[PDB]
């Protein structure tokens, strides 16, 4: 039950920004007592890291060698340490990442001060497998993209109710008090081509996924969540 | 060759697959150099790629007596799948089913042409991680930001239509129709209510269909822009 528990986790878990040493990746990753599980990206190559007690216990005296603690207490000083970062980018957290690609592995190096002590930890995270960066990013992606589709549906149908109404304001026989409101008639495809020629290329930048994490989070929550619920 | 198959892979749209009671997203690219093929199912990504003396040695291995050049036997199988797959319920004998090995995936076709038998078999391979990526992950993401924007255009779009109601409002003169009358937009509220009604169904992916059905455009559009 703890695997299960850890995975359903860092499925409800959203994605993050990481501002590495000369390079930025897209983050995710669920601590508990019993564990931890972190999936990383970088919009190329997603790296997974599923960890228990026994393997934390054993990299910490490996990487520390000086420091004696239960795991449940690694795991939740890394978990303190790492959740100011995530919530919020430009947090003096004091918390120095690097990166190395090492093999097909990733090893992923995080410094700390622990009340102005050193902490050093290492996730060595292998290749994702393709069922969980399937079910992590296609799917929830294209469930995203259809209910903003519908979404755009929806405003398309109320535009065109509104401007049923104004014309048949207009028909009443009435005049605006100014001009500049005027309005011109909404057409889905005069604005979807304009859309399309102009604003598109702006609005595809991905670039190095700041966007994705900044303006399509919740949307990817409650999309994870209608699948998680739905099976 | 290798670099105009890849574009053309890229530059091409998702299209449904109906064989033996299952689902298929498949992207087919042919060319007198060979073809490329990406099949998925929304849990695993198998790629192809065919060059003249594979899909040759291929087609002599199925085929035991179609004597062809391998130009033509290309040119014949993307004359009999294009049409397919740009549309769905096409009036052809492609009859298509899947053998999932363990690793790789055995796609055969089987069809009619001129009244006789035609074989063929897409050995596919698990996809790299930087192909599925580039493939798919990128060009959603770059869909969902632009489905975004567009969301966002609408919505100034409904607030100035809501300055012009309220202006002809305060004029004081009323509708001729009370049935016309529409609230005033709100983007909190209507996003509010969007996601507790309408998002369980507007997000069911299924088996993949919807997704090609509804904004196969919006797709080409982004992976075109990604290219350039």
């Known amino acids: 039950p703890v695997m299960e528990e850890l995975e359903q986790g860092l499925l409800m878990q959203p994605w993050a920004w990481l501002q590495l040493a000369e390079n930025s990746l897209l983050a995710k990753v669920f601590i508990t007592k019993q564990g931890y599980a972190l999936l990383v990206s970088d919009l190329q190559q997603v790296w997974h890291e599923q960890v228990d007690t026994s393997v934390v216990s054993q990299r910490a005296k490996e990487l520390n060698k000086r420091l004696t603690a239960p795991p449940a207490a690694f795991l939740c000083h890394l978990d303190n340490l790492?959740?100011?970062?995530?919530?919020?980018?430009?947090?003096?957290?004091?918390?120095?990442?690097?990166?190395?690609?090492?093999?097909?592995?990733?090893?992923?190096?995080?410094?700390?001060?622990?009340?102005?002590?050193?902490?050093?930890?290492?996730?060595?995270?292998?290749?994702?497998?393709?069922?969980?960066?399937?079910?992590?990013?296609?799917?929830?992606?294209?469930?995203?993209?259809?209910?903003l589709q519908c979404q755009v549906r929806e405003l398309a149908?109320?535009?065109?109710?509104?401007?049923?109404?104004?014309?048949?304001?207009?028909?009443?026989?009435?005049?605006?008090?100014?001009?500049?409101?005027?309005?011109?008639?909404?057409?889905?495809?005069?604005?979807?081509?304009?859309?399309?020629?102009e604003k598109l290329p702006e609005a595809c930048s991905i670039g190095d996924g700041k966007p994705f994490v900044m303006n399509l989070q919740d949307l990817y929550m409650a999309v994870t969540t209608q699948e998680v619920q739905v099976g």
């Open 82 to 147: 790492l959740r100011p970062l995530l919530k919020d980018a430009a947090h003096p957290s004091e918390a120095t990442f690097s990166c190395d690609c090492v093999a097909d592995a990733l090893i992923l190096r995080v410094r700390s001060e622990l009340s102005g002590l050193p902490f050093y930890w290492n996730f060595h995270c292998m290749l994702a497998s393709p069922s969980l960066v399937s079910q992590h990013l296609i799917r929830p992606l294209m469930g995203m993209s259809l209910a």
């Open 157 to 197: 149908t109320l535009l065109h109710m509104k401007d049923l109404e104004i014309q048949d304001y207009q028909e009443s026989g009435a005049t605006l008090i100014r001009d500049r409101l005027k309005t011109e008639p909404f057409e889905e495809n005069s604005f979807l081509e304009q859309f399309m020629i």
